[PDB]
Structure 1
Amino acid sequence: NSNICEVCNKWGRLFCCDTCPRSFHEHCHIPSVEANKNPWSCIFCRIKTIQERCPESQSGHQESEVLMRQMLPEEQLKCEFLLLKVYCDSKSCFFASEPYYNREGSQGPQKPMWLNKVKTSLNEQMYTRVEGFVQDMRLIFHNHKEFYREDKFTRLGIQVQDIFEKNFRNIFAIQETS
């Protein structure tokens, strides 16, 4: 197994996957690494199993259909994996914790949003459809772009949204287009 967390790339108290060489801090894995379970399989491995059981699940889909799906166990898992892919980028630090807004010439968003809030919402089963999770994720970056205006810091929102969107299209097998 790797000697660093797959998510934050640091050493520490690491839990090792039994079916792949990845390792995780307890609360870096999503869901948080389960208490007992020998053997244990990481979210990467669980996702790969879904695909292997239903190869046709990789055929292209329309985003509108994906958003309307109810959050049954496989969709819950796919949104947890997509959230975890965003935390894997170091630039997620800017979006992780609760923001505050006091900048001359800007007003804060009407509905603030942040990664740890989406993480608790998933853990508490607060989303009934994929659309609810996706809308809160996109809201994080939209709030950032609107608040930072012409400051070059706006680019951090475009960068982390690009990671989200590429991973959304991969995980939910969105039909490729020009």
Structure 2
Amino acid sequence: NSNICEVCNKWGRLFCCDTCPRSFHEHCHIPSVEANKNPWSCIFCRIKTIQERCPESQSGHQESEVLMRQMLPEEQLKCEFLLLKVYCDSKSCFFASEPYYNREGSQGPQKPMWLNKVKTSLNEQMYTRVEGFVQDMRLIFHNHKEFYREDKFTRLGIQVQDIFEKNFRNIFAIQETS
């Protein structure tokens, strides 16, 4: 196995996947690495299994259909994986914890949002449809763009949103378009 966490790229107390060479910190994995379970398969492996059991799941889909899906176990897992892929980018640090807003010439957002809040919401089964999760994820980046206005720091929001959107289209097999 790898000797660094797949998500944060640091060593430490690592749990090793039994079906691939990836390793994780306990709370870097989503869901948090399960207490017992031998063998244990990571989220990358569990998502690969879904695909392999239903090859047709990789045919293209319309976003509008994906968003209306109820959060059954497979869609829960897909959203957990998508959230994890965002944490995998080091620029997610900016968006992880609860923000505050005190900048001359800007007003903070009406509905603040951050990664760790989405993570808690998924853990507590607060989303009933994929749309709930995706709306909160997109709101993170939209709030940032709006608040930072012409400051070059706005770009961090564009960058992390692009990671989110590419991974959303991959994980949920959104139909490719120009």
Sort the TM-score into its range (normalised by shorter chain). Answer: over 0.9
Aligned counterparts of 1:101 and 1:27: Cα–Cα separation in 2: 28
What is the TM-score normalised by the length of structure 1? 1.00
Q: How many residues align?
A: 178
Aligned partner of 2:133 in structure 1 is 133
Q: Structure 1: any 5+ residue segments left out of the alignment?
A: none
> What is the identity percentage for the equivalent residue pairs of Structure 1 and Structure 2?
100
Pairwise CA distance, 1:103: 0.1
2:70 partner SS: coil
Which digits, 9 at most, give the CA deviation of each residue in 1:20-47, with x for residues without a partner?
Answer: 0000000000000000000000000000
Which digits, 9 at most, give the CA deviation of each residue in 1:68-93, with x for residues without a partner?
Answer: 00000000000000000000000000
Pairwise CA distance, 1:6: 0.0
Aligned counterparts of 1:149 and 1:50: Cα–Cα separation in 2: 41
Aligned counterparts of 2:65 and 2:85: Cα–Cα separation in 1: 22
Aligned counterparts of 1:106 and 1:116: Cα–Cα separation in 2: 24
Aligned counterparts of 1:5 and 1:108: Cα–Cα separation in 2: 34
Aligned counterparts of 1:51 and 1:148: Cα–Cα separation in 2: 39
Which digits, 9 at most, give the CA deviation of each residue in 1:103-145, with x for residues without a partner?
Answer: 0000000000000000000000000000000000000000000
Aligned counterparts of 1:73 and 1:168: Cα–Cα separation in 2: 17
What is the TM-score normalised by the length of structure 2? 1.00
Aligned counterparts of 1:149 and 1:60: Cα–Cα separation in 2: 35
Aligned partner of 1:21 in structure 2 is 21
RMSD of Structure 2 on Structure 1 (CA): 0.1
Q: Structure 2: any 5+ residue segments left out of the alignment?
A: none
